[PDB]
From Swiss-Prot:
Glycans are attached at residues 94, 113, 281. It is a single-pass type I membrane protein. Responsible for the proteolytic processing of the amyloid precursor protein (APP). Cleaves at the N-terminus of the A-beta peptide sequence, between residues 671 and 672 of APP, leads to the generation and extracellular release of beta-cleaved soluble APP, and a corresponding cell-associated C-terminal fragment which is later released by gamma-secretase. Cleaves CHL1. Monomer. Interacts with RTN1; RTN2; RTN3 and RTN4; the interaction leads to inhibition of amyloid precursor protein processing. Interacts with SNX6. Interacts with PCSK9. Interacts with NAT8 and NAT8B. Interacts with BIN1. Interacts (via extracellular domain) with ADAM10 (via extracellular domain). Interacts with SORL1; this interaction may affect binding with APP and hence reduce APP cleavage. Interacts with NRDC AND NRG1. Belongs to the peptidase A1 family. Residues 16-335 form the Peptidase A1 domain. The chain holds residues 60 to 446 of 501 of the full protein. One of its GO terms (cellular component) is synaptic vesicle. Disulfide bonds join 157-339, 208-362, 260-299. This is Beta-secretase 1. It is an enzyme of class 3 (hydrolase). It catalyses: Broad endopeptidase specificity. Cleaves Glu-Val-Asn-Leu-|-Asp-Ala-Glu-Phe in the Swedish variant of Alzheimer's amyloid precursor protein. The modification N6-acetyllysine is found at residues 67, 205, 209, 215, 229-230, 237.
Length: 365
């Protein structure tokens, strides 16, 4: 799968993109890779921020669906016209498929000024597609029309970022140790269940329901580890305590201020999420280093932040790990990334099995 290794580019805070082609003849575009949504959408008009855009008039294979589509994210909304056309990933599998494409014709605080991407690839399930679940998501179309296995994996490497999207398989060269899998609780977002949390090794004795209210998801289109309220205060409480030996401003834990050195790494704790495992009463844990939740912006940004719609395991989480979206078996795999920025002293980690009871009662119903 070395054809696909290192096919992801980006800039810190601006997402990860892959090169795609649309229409005949092929128009090359950079497309943000987003496991947190299920629309395939590309700029189709000359918005001043865009390096390029989809020009339907140039395409033999374009077909109008004569439906409008609207999509608001956490922030950012766009509106568009649905169509289908032929699509390829040059540094991906050797195929071409007909896919739904939203030609973005109006947007609001969506495109990033200074970014080098022109669209977004929603990789999650139909259930959350707009206007509705009859709009077959890209990856569903990819699997139905080719012999590409129903699986993709992400090694997000973390001012320029790099990484790999392996479509249809796994590249064992992108990780060390063993993959550990957690069930996809439901096929809409990539929903999982967190069952326990630990800073430097200390539990938080919270009802595990507080971790998955109203959901926990794996989202590559989100930068931060985003915890619910209770959970966020508790974890800074614990990190501020473990790291107290150097005084840090309040702006820095709000993610406003910066720290600058010429970096006492082991001043800072590891953070640990236990995930529901494959077997009744068995879990595993994933552990991130300071080198993960501290975003280089020799200065650093605290990258854990409060949330509101559930836990979101964003690039802060995913940059420590190789993440396998095993859609065929309703599960997501985590393994230590071979590219994660580590340490002579420490590493990010994933280990098990652990015994943890009542893992069902952990997710909101
Ligand atoms: C930070 C952010 O919102 N990133 C988005 C993609 C994105 C948007 C703009 C941008 F400039 C870069 C990436 C992700 O798609 C967010 N993913 C989840 C993340 C959550 C779900 C829990 C937090 O909020 C979302 N709300 C709406 C959508 C779109 C929908 C059509 C599926 C309802 C998705 C999400």
């Amino acid at each position: 799968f070395v054809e696909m290794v290192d096919n992801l580019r980006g800039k810190s805070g601006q997402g990860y993109y892959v090169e795609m082609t649309v229409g005949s003849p092929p128009q090359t575009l950079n497309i943000l890779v987003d496991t947190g949504s299920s629309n395939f959408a590309v700029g189709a008009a000359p918005h001043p921020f865009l390096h390029r855009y989809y020009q339907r008039q140039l395409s033999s294979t374009y077909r109008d669906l004569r439906k409008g589509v609207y999509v608001p994210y956490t922030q950012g909304k766009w509106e568009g016209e649905l169509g289908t056309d032929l699509v390829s990933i040059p540094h991906g599998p050797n195929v071409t498929v007909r896919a739904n494409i939203a030609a973005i014709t109006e947007s609001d605080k969506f495109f990033i000024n200074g970014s080098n991407w022109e669209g977004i690839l929603g990789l999650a399930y139909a259930e959350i597609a707009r206007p509705d679940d009859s709009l077959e998501p890209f990856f569903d179309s990819l699997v139905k029309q080719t012999h590409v296995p129903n699986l993709f994996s992400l090694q997000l490497c973390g001012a320029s970022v790099g990484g790999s999207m392996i479509i249809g398989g796994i590249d064992h060269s992108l990780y060390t140790g063993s993959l550990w899998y957690t069930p996809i609780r439901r096929e809409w977002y990539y929903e999982v269940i967190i069952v326990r949390v630990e800073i430097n090794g200390q539990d938080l004795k919270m009802d595990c329901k507080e971790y998955n209210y109203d959901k926990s998801i794996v989202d590559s289109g989100t930068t931060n580890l985003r915890l619910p309220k209770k959970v966020f205060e508790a974890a800074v409480k614990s990190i501020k305590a473990a790291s107290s030996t150097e005084k840090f401003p309040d702006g820095f834990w709000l993610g406003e201020q910066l720290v600058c050195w010429q970096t006492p790494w082991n001043i800072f704790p590891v953070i640990s999420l236990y995930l529901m495992g494959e077997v009744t009463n068995q879990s595993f844990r994933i552990t991130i280093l300071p080198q993960q939740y501290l975003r280089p912006v020799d200065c650093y940004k605290f990258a854990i932040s409060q949330s509101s719609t559930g836990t979101v395991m964003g690039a802060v989480i995913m940059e420590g790990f190789y993440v396998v979206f095993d859609r065929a078996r309703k599960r997501i795999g985590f393994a230590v990334s071979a590219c994660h920025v580590h340490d002579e002293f420490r590493t990010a980690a994933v280990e098990g099995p652990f015994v943890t009871l009542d893992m069902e009662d952990c997710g909101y119903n």
